[PDB]
Design an enzyme around this catalytic site. Sequence first.
Site, short mmCIF file in Angstrom:
data_model
loop_
_atom_site.label_atom_id
_atom_site.label_comp_id
_atom_site.label_asym_id
_atom_site.label_seq_id
_atom_site.Cartn_x
_atom_site.Cartn_y
_atom_site.Cartn_z
N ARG A 131 0.87 -1.17 0.00
CA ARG A 131 0.00 0.00 0.00
C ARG A 131 0.89 1.21 0.00
NH1 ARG A 131 -2.98 0.46 4.98
NH2 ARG A 131 -1.62 -1.22 5.85
N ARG A 159 5.15 10.71 7.47
CA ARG A 159 4.30 10.58 8.68
C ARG A 159 5.11 10.75 9.99
NH1 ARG A 159 2.47 4.81 8.54
NH2 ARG A 159 2.00 5.71 6.50
#
Length: 226
Positions: A160, A171
């Site tokens: 993904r 992130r």
Amino acid sequence: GASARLLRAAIMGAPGSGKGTVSSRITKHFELKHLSSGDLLRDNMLRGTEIGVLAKTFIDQGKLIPDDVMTRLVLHELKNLTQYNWLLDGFPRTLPQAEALDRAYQIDTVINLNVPFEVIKQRLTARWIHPGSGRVYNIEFNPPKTMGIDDLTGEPLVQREDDRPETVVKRLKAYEAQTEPVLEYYRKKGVLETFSGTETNKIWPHVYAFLQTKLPQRSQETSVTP
Ligand SMILES: Nc1ncnc2c1ncn2[C@@H]1O[C@H](COP(=O)(O)O)[C@@H](O)[C@H]1O
């Protein structure tokens, strides 16, 4: 029980830091309420409340819900929990959430798990899927025999976009940027307790020994009767 002796604590740590495991073990061994802001948001979403609609919007764009919304929601729940010890998890995430919380309740201890960047990055980019069967391979626990290949069919595995190294780096840098002011804020307050490690099972004994000085071990489920 512990009458003027209730623990007001918070636990902090990057995604992949083992915070989830350590929070489970605290709740396994001690008598406390664990309030997770990600779980409040999931519940509101599941129930289709207006904050559930607001939140799903932001979470889909991987953003933080605004501070005032998040603070109101958390403070509303804590109103109910004043008679318990609690462990806040995922809140405060930003310095306006930490200042706000300080105007309502005195926080006694903030536990911070500090795990090296490369270790967290390896955890978070470890998952691969064989699209056709749903077979999951995790590079740390059950790697395929040939990298990027499904063992049974020889067909390629995919990752993904969320699990890709560049996304994960992004992130982590955002989480750092966000929470670095929060840690500094609790550090000036003298309430920050940092536990550093590369494996969760080497960190846990220390967190366990540290909270045992502070609170009631949940009465006795010795389930490993070894
Ligand atoms: N304290 C918070 N402030 C803002 N957004 C939050 C907070 N806690 C949870 N969320 C969010 O919900 C998502 C998932 O939370 P988490 O379970 O902690 O990763 C985050 O990316 C944010 O969108």
